[PDB]
Amino acid sequence: NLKDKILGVAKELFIKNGYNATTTGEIVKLSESSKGNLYYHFKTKENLFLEILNIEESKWQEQWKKEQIKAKTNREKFYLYNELSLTTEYYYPLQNAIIEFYTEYYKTNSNEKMNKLENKYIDAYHVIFKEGNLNGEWSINDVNAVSKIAANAVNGIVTFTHEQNINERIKLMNKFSQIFLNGLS
Amino acid sequence: NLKDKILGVAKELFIKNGYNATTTGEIVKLSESSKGNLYYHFKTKENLFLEILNIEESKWQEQWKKEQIKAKTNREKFYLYNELSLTTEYYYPLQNAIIEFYTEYYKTNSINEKMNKLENKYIDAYHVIFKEGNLNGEWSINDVNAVSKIAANAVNGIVTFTHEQNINERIKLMNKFSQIFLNGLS
Helix, strand or coil, X not given: CCXXXXXXXXXXXXXXXXXXXCCHXXXXXXXXXXXXXXXXXXXXXXXXXXXXXXXXXXXXHHHHHHHHHHCCXXXXXXXXXXXXXXXXXXXXXXXXXXXXXXXXXXXXXXXXXXXXXXXXXXHHHHHHHHHHHHCCCCCCCCHXXXXXXXXXXXXXXXXXXXXXXXXXXXXXXHHHHHHHHHHHC | CHHHHHHHHHHHHHHHHHHHHCCHHHHHHHCCCCHHHHHHHHCCXXXXXXXXXXXXXXXXXXXXXXXXXXXXCHHHHHHHHHHHHHHHXXXXXXXXXXXXXXXXXXXXXXXXXHHHHHHHHHHHHHHHHHHHHHCCCCCCCCCHHHHHHHHHHHHHHHHHHCCCCCHXXXXXXXXXXXXXXXXXXX
16 A cells, blocks of 8 residues: 555654654655655645554554453453553554654644544543443542543653563553552542 | 853753754854863763753752752652642753653663663652651552652653643642542552
């Protein structure tokens, strides 16, 4: 494919290098195409990016729903999601690029995705926490808040520890999950 | 002092133009030093930059030392510290140069290694709070080192990935996290 040949390079480059690091040109080189390509479906550079964030985010959320079955209680689903977050090949491997990007385009008026993609990012925690209320596993009045806090705290543990033994990572994340859930009841 | 003049001039350049755009040439001339002297003190731009970060870290700790008096109990020092981490970065000028740098060197072990010794300094703050909290029955934590890494990285996640909301909400959420976390320790 071609449109899905560029994305494959954009993704790989945004991961290896940074957002700025890789530019419209660099893509075309390895992606092997021209300028026009990036016009109809691929408007601006930030467009080709927000696109990938959409894909990747969906791939992850999909993989989660296919694997969330191994977790019988929502308390287990919480633990699992956070753990899985450390090993997926999806979405999380772009957080560094997201930061860079967000701090270099939070000017344009299209912080619309960053607040549209955010809902999908914290939705898994929304469902997990909401369902937990239906199962009496816990009682949280401010779900939306907790969801946001959890998603970001976790994203932090995954992103700012990406420089050490992965079993150490998985250990921490679990001690985290424990402490969090424990502070909820 | 010529070393200090470089660190100072370089800090501003990085702040005004970012890491990548800033060159050792500019730094050399504006600090009225030389390529040779710059090499002898820091060898590289990356190293020069890590030194800046080191100075800053030191200043942050010095600021904390003073600021933490407003918090009598460790429980409070926890709430306060996390709040400071979020509010101060909201307007930290070097922040942009750190990002550019960090997300461009998290692939080299040489640099990523020194950046860990650096964050460790940041994490020590939590380590102290928790240990002192133990020796006061504010809580009981057998895995202080662990909790400290967790607190620090979770707080950082809230600070970094929340940027898309008004500051009072951010503060509110942070304070909410500090509550949940502190509650899950008793």
